[PDB]
Amino acid sequence: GTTLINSSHAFEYGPMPLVQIKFEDTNTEIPVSTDAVRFGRSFKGQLNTVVFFRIIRRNKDPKIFSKELWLNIVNIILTLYEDLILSPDIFPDLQKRLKLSNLPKPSPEISINKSKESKGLLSTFASYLKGDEEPTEEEIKSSKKAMECIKSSNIAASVFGNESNITADLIKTLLDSAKTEKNADNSRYFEAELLFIIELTIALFLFCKEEKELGKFILQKVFQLSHTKGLTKRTVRRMLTYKILLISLCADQTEYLSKLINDELLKKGDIFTQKFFATNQGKEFLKRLFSLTESEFYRGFLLGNENFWKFLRKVTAMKEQSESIFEYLNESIKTDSNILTNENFMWVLGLLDEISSMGAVGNHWEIEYKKLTESGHKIDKENPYKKSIELSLKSIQLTSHLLEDNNDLRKNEIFAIIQALAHQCINPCKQISEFAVVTLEQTLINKIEIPTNEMESVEELIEGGLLPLLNSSETQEDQKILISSILTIISNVYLHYLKLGKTSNETFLKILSIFNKFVEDSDIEKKLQQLILDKKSIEKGNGS
């Protein structure tokens, strides 16, 4: 009897299509629809609605409800939604907890703006103007009364703001009432209603988290509704945020997360574009994913996936997000230090190398830097990529520290760390290169154990470190600085580890062989003679 929900049961079939008038006096919008006008001309319907929602509000029994009653409540709520009466923003707290903002309002049909609020009668006739059908001001009066009656009712608090009506039946019927077809009749509120239903059902699930089966069902429904076609981009974005939230709330849904990562994040494209991950919302999405890296259940899968790390490499190439990725990585390494599993090393080291390779923009600034310094002039705003340069330095420091706190390496990761430090040592940036050589020297002299069963021969250390780098010196003029740094590090490491006694003169023999490989140009030869004098000095010193 609420004259809003009905069933399929004059000479013109015209159902009076929906039109909206927004006026100009203040900011007040009035929808005019067939359901709206029928509600405006039915006092009995107004009484029925107010009493029905009062009864729903007071009813302190979840079990005494029926399935048909739940369906009727949902249908009334949805009908008020589609008539532009019920405010779509039902749960502002959930939107603020995430970083979404003001669910897409169900758009009206063909709309007419009424600048003047007054009566009609003999006016605006025989002088062009007009033309639209438009409400006859009685429909306008009725629609105003309809909005007033609905606001006098407290639908939002009556149904959801009860804390006892929110049981599995409500979420189930809300999901089952969703629409999966874009009919021409309901084209104006398809995506909006999808988002509204998803958000409201997720909020109601938040109110009752200790229902595992309901969680699985709601996740399945959300995924099925998301994989549909003909959805605008913003709908896909919001549903992505909702999907990651639901995955976080549940306990063991590894397959769904795999589907999310692979299908949505890696393959979509042109949707998860550059700007999407910098909109205050992509940051929330990424923070949710990284927090999901720390959980009782979603740990082992998120470690050994290689598609998670492929996506991490994709998002760490983005200029703005690099600092956030580095902060997450650094916190994970410092706090528990268990993110580095037995097989995770190459991926995380790749992420570190990517965040340390900002020497591109470093030398981009350095171009004009050297252009103005080679002249007798002055530059004040220095290192426009100062954030990027400091990030690269912190990444190299993170690698240096990463060579520690494990103590059970396989020497493959040792070679990898040394190679990564060298590869950054090739970098154009002067500060980056200097930090790389300094930290590589420090790590080599006081961070790798010499007489360990893992690696008990410094020859292999040198030959998996500097030797592989110098074997690829085919960069023409760029080889001179790289070789000078390589040999300088070699000499320093050789001296430092000789000063601590030790044995295996094959170390000396191999270093001599490397020097012979670079014996040309005689500058390396004089360096060899100098370190030979240093060798004699160390001989005397260790003797006495």
Swiss-Prot record:
Name recorded for this polypeptide: ARF guanine-nucleotide exchange factor 2
Extra facts: Present with 7700 molecules/cell in log phase SD medium.
Disruption phenotype: Exacerbates the cold sensitivity of a DRS2-knockout.
The protein's role, per its UniProt record: Activates the ARF proteins by exchanging bound GDP for free GTP. Plays a role in maintaining mitochondrial morphology. Stimulates DRS2 flippase activity.
Annotated localization: Cytoplasm, Cytosol; Membrane; Golgi apparatus membrane
Subunit-structure text: Interacts (via SEC7 domain) with DRS2 (via C-terminus); the interaction is direct. Interacts with GMH1.
Underlying gene: GEA2
Boundaries of the shown chain within the full protein: 867 to 1417 of 1459
